[PDB]
From a paper:
Here, we report the first structure of glycerol kinase from the thermophilic filamentous fungus Chaetomium thermophilum (CtGK). Glycerol kinase (EC 2.7.1.30) catalyzes the transfer of phosphate moiety from ATP to glycerol to form glycerol 3-phosphate (G3P). Overall, the CtGK polypeptide chain can be divided into two distinct domains classified by Pfam as FGGY_N (residues 65–325) and FGGY_C (residues 331–583) connected by a flexible region. A similar case is found in CtGK, which forms extended dimers via the interaction between the C-terminal domains with a prominent contribution from hydrophobic residues (Phe422, Gly436, Phe389, Leu394, Thr437, Phe439, Gly440, Ile441, Thr437, Thr445, Leu438, Ile450, Trp580).
Subsequently, by replacing the cryoprotectant solution with 20–25% glycerol, we were able to solve the enzyme-substrate complex with a clear electron density that could be attributed to the bound glycerol moiety. In total, three different crystal structures were obtained in the presence of glycerol, constituting 13 polypeptide chains. Generally, the same extent of the chain could be modeled as in the apo structures, i.e., for residues 65–583 with an approximate 9aa gap between H18 and B18. The substrate is bound in an evolutionarily conserved cleft within the N-terminal domain that opens towards the C-terminal domain. The glycerol molecule is coordinated by polar interactions with side chains of Glu149, Arg 148, Asp317, Gln318, and additionally with Arg148 main-chain amide. The carbon chain of glycerol packs against hydrophobic Trp168 and Phe342. A similar mode of binding was described previously for P. falciparum GK, where Phe271 and Tyr135 undergo shift upon substrate or cofactor binding. However, the movement of equivalent residues (Phe342 and Tyr200) was not observed in either of the presented CtGK complexes. Of note, we solved and refined five CtGK structures, and each of them belongs to a different space group, despite crystals having grown in the same buffer condition. We observed that in the absence of nucleotide, CtGK adopts open conformation, which upon nucleotide binding closes up.
Residue numbers in the entry:
A (entry chain D): 65 to 540, 551 to 583
B (entry chain A): 65 to 540, 550 to 583
The structure:
């Protein structure tokens, strides 16, 4: 086959895309599924809601694939990319879930996180797995379920509990789950580096990480850790429109976006804009443990005599959310297109600085007692100035994270690719280039995340032979270049840093 | 004669009102006049623009007075109240102005005040006149004119330069000016305490004050300082619809407001809401020199048989301006009415605090390197919350100033009366009561400033015999807002305000 498919299983969305050898999607289908919020801070999904949405997107895309004269014979393989950390538990014997998936934003584990941080050896986990303790990793979600949901506890104690991130669950069921010969219970190194069970350097489950959380290896069934690109580890789709088509790629969704942007060299970074931001920074074959609260994770692992590549990761809470705040909360304008117009309406920020720390500031500032704080207001401040400061806020924090990634890794920032929500704003992307002093590359093929999984599967099956082949095949309103004098750029950043400094201490108990 | 007229000459508008014995206006007329802004920071008025606007208001109001069947035969006297500091210079022989009036917000004296602040003896001015050096007092404006307007240079050196605040210019001209027999060149104690020429304790021109600025008393003609209520010192209207009616009252406008609210006892205070705020605090018969940058001024001086009364004054730059900012700059709503509505749409400030320091903060903070700074924003913050915070900002600053006046004077806060612009917001004033822990009196008759000058003229001429007669006559939407909030919540919200203020200083760099 000449085409490659890509399952993109998201937090709010599932979709299937079929790419050609030049990385362009020829057929696609997207479905918004149900998310469940039982309590405040609780976030759950029916595991079958994830699967069935994927399956319908597969069917939907292949009907339009048929309308252009192709069949599953034309697809050489498919890759999977998925929301990370989201924790799924099922019965190893039946393959049926024992509880709804706990989605990555779920906060029901705070108390447990507090307890675990006080435990002995909690100091050592960052160095082992790349991540600190928080509500996010799958380790604490799974531990919570074992201690609070009893169908899970007894499954565990009886040796029939299976754990999986959403990739593992989808691969397991798409291969036929329990009912099938050679059942596939696997996860790729990227997804696996998000749990806190995997030694980041060896890419193997570590007994000291598993021991810290109290999960017994020979009682629970963990997914075998395999490369993100492999022609046989992931099995094949058992039934349906893709019956018999191999799965050959598997990547956590943020890693997939880095791959889709061809960020294959150290110093190459990406930012995905949504309600917030996820930033990843290729740091090469050698892992880096951050000194500024960045996450150390696997960028991609392509097996074939390939040394796995690592990344540093940072996040921003308020990006697109800031635009939503200007539209709905303040009534500046009803659509984001017009917020950008307001920002372009004025020459500069009018001295305005908006520290958008709605829920505090994360890496590298780590300021939890700040709230949204707007500086520089006068009688002559207008909506346009505030709109600019809102866009500038994300670029300032983006630079702050990229700068921290530079000092941690010692690899000079070489490029920044962007995709999703705010990346469409020409003004803010230009501002990012100006502030950071680096070109901002924005592809007009907008399905970068899905493209990453296609590349992984395509490499496993020879659609592309090397990453150099990938970049030039994919290569064949796209790049913003620094145009601001660097003195003005440093001035603007220093008053950002200052606004931040004055924002700390606002929330007193 | 049983009615009393009032000339209210303001910064943008003049007005003439006729009050009855109970303090209600029976006829009124207002005219917006022309203000000139030649340079950035320069504010001028044609002195005849203010005189004729007054004359037109008099004509307009008297026609309405005639519609009710009355004439000047029914008006016992009139009083004047005026924008303060606004400086007028005219020629002593001809009575015509030698330059445009420099109005109080004018900033052309920045340089001159910078040098004067560096002159030795400058440290002594506040203790003598109650004011510090700044762009506002008449002293720096007059000195500037003599040093930069050669027509006034020559008039001074020729001994034919006359100086006057707006009150003295109007009284002078309404009496006949140069041509009249018994020409009147006077100013009341309040307007005179805004000059920096007057010793505040003696209410006499002081040679040390005049000497500091280089003004020679035997070469310029200074207006004779007279009481704010006097049956003869102000003369009479020479011409027109009120020909022959005596002038018997004269008060600086913010002093007039305090009088109109009947703030005659120590601890009684008033706030006048406009684009900003003007607060005066009655401190009794002996002046108080502030330790918090407040101004020591004459509250009112009702002449023979009465000891002059003094006051502490503070100001807030942004009050109604904050509501304008929400409507025009942010598009929250097109009318002030509906900004209140949004603020009432929410239960509280949502954790929001708006340090409305667009031009820094004045008394008691004195922070020049802050700007407008909004705190406590989240995804759940709404226009209503920010509206509340904007109203609350004026209440927090109002309390801050009243707190300073208490510590300066040692007189417990007894009363707070309110008038003008933002005082119409039921929510803003209820909040003021909550934050300050005292009832807030809001009169239904909303021409409080003009009534102050009527009271002075009425007292001078026996329309009212004593100040308790005044209080009794006058006190005879809502009127009074009482504290509803628990004291602890009020202190918590103030300390949050103080915190926000403290975190906004240092924004501007130099």
């Amino acid at each position: 086959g000449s085409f490659v498919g890509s399952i993109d299983q998201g937090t709010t969305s599932s979709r299937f895309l079929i790419f050609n050898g030049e990385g362009n999607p020829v057929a696609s289908h997207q479905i918004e599924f149900e998310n469940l919020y039982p309590k405040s801070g609780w976030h759950e999904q029916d595991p079958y809601e994830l699967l069935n949405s994927v399956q319908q997107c597969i069917d939907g895309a292949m009907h339009k694939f048929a309308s252009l004269g192709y069949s599953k014979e034309n697809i050489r393989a498919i890759g999977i990319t998925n929301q990370r950390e989201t924790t799924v538990v099922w019965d190893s014997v039946t393959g049926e879930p024992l509880h709804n998936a706990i989605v990555w934003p779920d906060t029901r584990t705070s108390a447990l996180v507090r307890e675990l941080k006080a435990r002995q050896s909690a100091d050592s986990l960052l160095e082992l797995c790349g991540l600190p303790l928080s509500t996010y990793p799958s380790s604490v979600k799974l531990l919570w379920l074992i201690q609070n949901v009893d169908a899970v506890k007894q499954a565990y104690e009886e040796g029939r509990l299976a754990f999986g991130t959403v990739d593992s669950w989808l691969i397991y069921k798409l291969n036929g789950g329990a009912q099938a010969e050679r059942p596939i219970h696997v996860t790729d190194s990227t997804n696996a580096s998000r749990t806190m069970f995997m030694n980041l350097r060896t890419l193997q489950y570590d007994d000291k990480l598993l021991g810290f959380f109290g999960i017994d290896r020979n009682k629970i069934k963990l997914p075998k850790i395999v490369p993100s690109s492999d022609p046989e580890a992931f099995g094949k789709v058992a039934t349906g429109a893709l019956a018999g088509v191999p799965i050959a790629g598997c990547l956590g969704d943020q890693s997939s976006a880095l791959v889709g942007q061809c960020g294959f060299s150290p110093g190459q970074a990406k930012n995905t804009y949504g309600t917030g931001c996820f930033l990843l920074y290729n740091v090469g074959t050698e892992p880096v443990i951050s000194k500024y609260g960045l996450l150390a994770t696997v960028a991609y692992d392509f097996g074939r005599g390939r040394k796995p590549v690592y990344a540093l990761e940072g996040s921003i809470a308020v990006a697109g959310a800031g635009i939503t705040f200007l539209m709905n909360n303040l009534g500046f304008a009803p659509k984001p297109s017009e917020i950008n117009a307001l920002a372009e309406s004025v020459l500069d920020n009018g001295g305005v600085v908006f520290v958008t720390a709605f829920s505090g500031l994360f890496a590298p500032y780590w300021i939890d007692d700040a709230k949204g704080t707007l500086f520089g207001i006068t009688q002559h401040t207008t909506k346009g100035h505030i709109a600019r400061a809102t866009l500038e806020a994300t670029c300032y924090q983006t630079r702050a994270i990229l700068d921290a990634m530079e000092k941690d890794s010692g690899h000079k920032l070489e490029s920044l690719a962007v995709d999703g929500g705010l990346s469409a704003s020409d003004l803010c992307m230009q501002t990012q280039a100006d502030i950071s002093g680096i070109p901002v590359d924005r592809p007009r093929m907008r399905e970068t995340t899905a493209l990453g999984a296609a590349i992984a599967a395509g490499l496993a099956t020879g659609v592309w032979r090397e990453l150099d082949h990938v970049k030039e095949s994919i290569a064949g309103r796209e790049v913003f270049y620094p145009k601001m004098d660097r003195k003005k750029a440093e001035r603007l950043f220093r008053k950002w840093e200052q606004a931040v400094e004055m924002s700390r201490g606002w929330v007193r108990e």
